[PDB]
Structure formats: C-alpha cells, structure tokens
C-alpha cells in the first residue's frame, strides 16, 4: 500500500516466500536492500573446539 501498487495474490504452498517475490517486483533501493538481507539470513555452521 505504501508504494501505490496492487497487493499481491499469494496462493497456498508456493515455493517462494512473499519477501522473495517482492524483491523483484519492487523498484526502490533502500527498501530492496533490507529485503535482500532477510532472504539471505542464515546460520553459519562452523566447527569451534
């Protein structure tokens, strides 16, 4: 709603999360840079001691 575009129609069980769709459809830069960290936030499996 804050960008003026039509709200997304998300069907059940799609393989993409709605943040993973809305980084392609959006066109800003400061709100598409935060939206890329949320999709690529993962634990780092390292072996210590």
């Amino acid at each position: 709603p804050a960008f003026g575009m039509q709200r997304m129609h998300y069907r059940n069980g799609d393989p993409q999360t709605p943040f993973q769709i809305a980084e392609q459809q959006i066109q800003n830069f400061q709100v598409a840079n935060w939206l890329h960290f949320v999709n690529n936030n993962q634990f780092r499996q390292v072996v210590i001691d």
Binding site: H9, Y10, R11, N12
Partner: protein
C-alpha cells in the same frame, strides 16, 4: 365351431428373470478431501490465501 386340434398354441417365454428398479443403490461413491478439489481447469477452487 370349436376345433380342438386347430386351436392349440405353444406360448413361448423365458424361464427366469430378476428385475431391479433402483440402479444407483449399488454404487457407493465418496468425495475427495475438499481442500484439494479441482475446477474445470487444472487448478483448485478456493486456492488464494
């Protein structure tokens, strides 16, 4: 005049029938799970969250 030798007739029929009336009392139908029910196309009805 009543001629006995010219009035005999051999009536022909069957031996054994078994006549039924309600034909759909033999089938036993069942619905699929209603969250997965498809329309005239491939996709399911009421899919959008």
């Amino acid at each position: 005049q009543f001629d006995f030798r010219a009035s005999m007739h051999m009536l022909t029929s069957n031996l054994t029938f078994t006549v039924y009336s309600d034909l759909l009392a033999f089938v036993s139908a069942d619905t699929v799970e209603p969250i997965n029910a498809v329309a005239f196309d491939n996709m399911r009805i009421m899919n959008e969250l």
